[PDB]
Symmetry: C4
Subunit: 388 residues, 4 copies
């Protein structure tokens, strides 16, 4: 086993095919399914798995009462087989905490969990299923990371952390890890004004992250990382197709180097693939809530402040709940190119569905096709009434 290198480009995305779906909430109505949130997907050379933050209780368990809360001593990063539900019996604990990332470098998996109270959180970096490095809070205000997979290049796996305010300037850092050890770190540069929950992918020795500007921006900050030189910049998606939520209506001209205003102190984890004409953005259909999800082909979104969709695909109807979304690819597939993939978290329960005392989610996940495939919509599928 050698370290993986990002030596391919993206395949052409002409549409998106179904990849994985767990139906966790449907199934959890009558079986031992952990309450989760902040899910993602990550591949090993021999396996792709579902990841999420457990709440340390089953949906039907009485301890699910209160699981709207993000941070407790009862959370862990868990992983489980693709399209199975996160059950008590089939889930593997990666590490303990309430904020996480994980990736495989071609030889083994790095996993990072942050735990602790708001003013005294710490990150523990696991490599090869053993803790190797720890990082203490630097700003004493909820140290936090991506909540989706990191990408590695020749052993170097960059990871974006934020510590500080969610509603004002914070301190963001890029850690460059190898075999669990800190090669290097830098404070955020470029023109992104606030960074949270970066969704990352890698192609051609470059790692692109689309993040969440929780403070001011309804366009998304991007961080472009060079994992060999261990340097980066940042900016925003220029496109007027705004991809945060909530958000104002799409203008005609976006902003490249500043937050697009109209919505403050809020947002959602999201992602894009930024590849010239082969550029697709994800967003919730609603501008007001986390419902619906669509992919839009927006040629040159990153660099073109007037760019609009030339093609699209519904993933989740606007009458269905969505949530977080992020990027992963199977870097170990055979072929000339990396096939873009993504997941959408389908949040159920609180605060939108408050007849139940819990909040959980299921997952849907899709990869790109070079065909023009017909679309379906992919809702969670559970009847809340069944839990009353």
């Amino acid at each position: 086993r050698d370290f993986n290198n990002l030596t391919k480009g993206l395949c052409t995305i002409n549409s998106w095919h179904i990849y994985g779906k767990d139906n966790a909430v449907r199934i959890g109505e009558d079986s031992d399914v952990l309450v989760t949130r902040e899910p993602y997907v990550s591949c090993d050379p021999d396996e792709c798995r579902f990841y999420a933050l457990s709440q340390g209780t089953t949906i039907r368990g009485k301890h699910s009462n209160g699981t709207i809360h993000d941070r407790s001593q009862y959370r862990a990063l868990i992983s489980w087989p693709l399209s199975s539900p996160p059950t008590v019996y089939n889930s593997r604990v990666e590490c303990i905490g309430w904020s996480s990332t994980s990736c495989h470098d071609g030889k083994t998996r790095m996993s990072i969990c942050i735990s602790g109270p708001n003013n005294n959180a710490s990150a523990v970096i696991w490599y090869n299923r053993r803790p190797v490095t720890e990082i203490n809070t630097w700003a004493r205000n909820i140290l936090r990371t991506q909540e989706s997979e990191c990408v590695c290049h020749n052993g170097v796996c960059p990871v974006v952390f934020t510590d500080g305010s969610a509603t004002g300037p914070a301190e963001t850092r890029i850690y460059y890890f190898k075999e669990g050890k800190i090669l290097k770190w830098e404070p955020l540069a470029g023109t992104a004004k606030h960074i949270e929950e970066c969704s990352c992918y890698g192609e051609r020795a470059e790692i692109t992250c689309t993040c969440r500007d929780n403070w001011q921006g309804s366009n998304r900050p991007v961080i472009r990382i060079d994992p060999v030189a261990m340097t980066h910049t940042s900016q925003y998606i220029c496109s007027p197709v705004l991809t945060d939520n909530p958000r104002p209506n799409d203008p005609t001209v976006g902003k490249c180097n500043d937050p697009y205003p109209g919505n403050n102190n809020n947002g959602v984890k999201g992602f894009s693939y930024l590849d010239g004409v082969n550029t697709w953005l994800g967003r919730t259909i609603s501008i007001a809530s986390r419902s619906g999800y669509e992919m839009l082909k927006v040629p040159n979104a990153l660099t073109d402040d007037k760019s609009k969709p030339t093609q699209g695909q519904t993933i989740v109807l606007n009458t269905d709940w969505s949530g977080y979304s992020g990027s992963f690819m199977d870097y170990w597939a055979e072929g000339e190119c990396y096939r873009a993939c993504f997941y959408v978290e389908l949040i159920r329960g609180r605060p939108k569905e408050d007849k139940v005392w819990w909040t959980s989610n299921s997952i849907v996940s899709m990869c790109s096709s070079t065909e023009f495939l017909g679309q379906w919509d992919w809702p969670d599928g559970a009847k809340i009434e069944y839990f009353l």
Copy 2:
């Protein structure tokens, strides 16, 4: 690992011995068993497993209400260990969809799932547990496949799809896949007038499929595939022993090149082994419903329009529910010959048992013996009343 070649003939079938039985519905009365339908069996070089389409809910789960329906975003092709039930905790998801096939080529497994709405379905071809190829609907009318295992020869694995009407001419195609990639495809030829849900087996470098003529035929269409030349023909079982359901009474003379009439717009997945004198047909005992199942030795059924049974075996009594049946063999057993096997889906619940709101099934499966073994009958075994 080399690609498997079909270099053996069928063993002599003098009877059928018990191979596998899951008792899923009995067990699912009180444990976390997925609702399923359209089951089958498929072998790897080192393992044989049960396959079926999950409905993404347990039997006792409230979400089982409505599982009579065939097509939802909640279905997946699942596999699980032989004679165990399809449980939430022991089931492995092969791919997402509501129509499927799967086979191992000697090196790895190809799995195919079709998903999407009626007029915009698509097939995703997985190979080595990664998606490789996609095929869009060509007739915009429920793209669909075999619902039992494909067979491979020197890497080439043919698969039969139908897109179009279930009650009139449709467009059927034979895809020749290798390592997940389309070598070639052809439109259906021969004299079969309508093709659905082919049950396939392979011997001596030839692949025989017995299918379902849903439109007109109560005899079964056969497709004979040559996986080296990648060509095929089709016809019907000539025999007057009619093997679809529902069906008219057995005549005295069958038809070789046309549907045997008397029953329209309906049928059931079934199978046969067509091997000269060593020819066995499966059918439901009832002509009106999916109840009972018998094997009949009908020498030269494929070519002899006057052929009648010379031997038989009851699998399921006429007072017990059956359903789909299909063919598989363990191509990787040691020995001079391939031992024919088959499964029968034992459907419970709706529409026949409508005091419950669900439809599910269990499985029984048998292989051939060169002995003359005594028969038993093999019912599902669950008391519906227990679910009231």
Copy 3:
């Protein structure tokens, strides 16, 4: 991997230490535990597992109603990890049927299940988890086998079957199997008048089975097998320490070549280790029912019609339910000698505990020590009242 040869003798048995206990019924009060009976233990070169006949339902399942019955289409030989309970999720199905044996020959496992109606049963011999040979009933009266593990020597694994009456002369046969195939078989010889449910072990190229004379004998028939010459004789344990159940009181002088009378048409599966002075017999403590279990050191029991205990150990108190017992050894342990082991089936429910509608069991298992260890008693441990 070579075939195992029985090249060691028995270790000296100075007592018995705890080996395994599943607590199945206790645990099954509140978890998904299969109803079973006729358990045993069998070792592979790398693992020892629990075996039993599933009834194809959980204890708490409604389908457990009626599980006093021995023979149904819902039974299977299952295996599961040592001292775990037979759960729906952790049990592996070896083959389908209601009478079984299984052993490993050093290279792979042979497993045999008999299924079918009383007058038309058949045995299917699985080898390396594929069916290889079938044997039809010869006497059309419940073909049946050992219900505990067979022993192999240089690939040859003898197995004892009985077909015919349980209350009069029957036809017993010794099949000599290699790689699943019949090398040879013989009708029973020696002076044993009726043979059922043989418990076998092997030492020094010889295989000794202690069986159940259901017709007349309260002493136990023994079959001594020579697996190289593939020949055998039979007799009874000479000792006046009678080891069947029910049974008359111990006389002073036993019988070597005839059933010891006083009890007809009944009995229980049991076992012994017959090794000169190093001879231990198992029996229920009660003479009337399957309660209690003790080991007695009875020097030269096989050959000495006046032999009495010189040492003993309580396994189960007379106020606790027992049941079947049988022999196994780990032939693949390191050391100069084979360490004798045995299990006792702890039957709960019907017919003795008829406030519940079910019959099931748990297992306790012990191996020998060259120490003189203190004894405990090892009851099932479940409160029947909890199931009311």
Copy 4:
């Protein structure tokens, strides 16, 4: 695989990071979780697992009634994946008994379980998952061992046993095992007056155990073992920071060679790391009950009868239940040094929470960091009221 040698020293402990947490009781409110107690953690070269004594019943099972009791035929040493709960379906039974230890020697795992009545207990030593040696009670008064992992050096794995009174002089012995066989044993030497439940670790070819003086001492006896010479001494932690429970208030000067008095016939399993200035002690926060847990850096605690804390960390608040605590390290991590770790048993139910009829626990576990990390508190997290 070679035998592991203890060739490293301890890393500097500047704090403690979260390692593992199972949330067993929270989760067990609504899933098939075994009742346990006396947990620990132990590493293999490729895996770290949770260990504990099962009570052979689920928490919600009716058989959990009475699980305050320590010793029954229903207990076993179980192991399961790190931070998962001890479920019926994912737990592996190591051996049967109600007192245990276990360790890996670099080649395979030794596991020891003691079972039997109070006056006739016996230890069975398993090696490579087979029983190898047995040891009978020597004092006929509850033969018992460490209840946490042993440490090995070049194949030699010492284990501390006590047989005799818990409230007066007892007979303690150090067994030196290799490949399951007794190399040697010695009666306890040094100045420790009573030894129970030793928590052991190894560094630089020396094995240090901190134990429980149940008779008189509120300071903890230490046993220092030399696994090459197979010799040992014992003493007490000199420090006035008293680490048993219950205990008197901390004096100003401790005792090195005698029990520190004021509390009789009681205590709790605990541990320390004794490494010059790099010395950390664990204790319950309360002096009266098993609530709270803190680590205190007490430079030279072992040798300095006036030593006081210079640094500390809260693990469990004084308003949360604790229990047993013990030591383990991953001897197979890469790096220049061994990273100290420990677990705390979080006992719930009886006798402190007597509205439920059961006693069980969950686990939290931590390892050391060379950073100064912020602390959190790590409670069990279950609401007892949910079980009413």
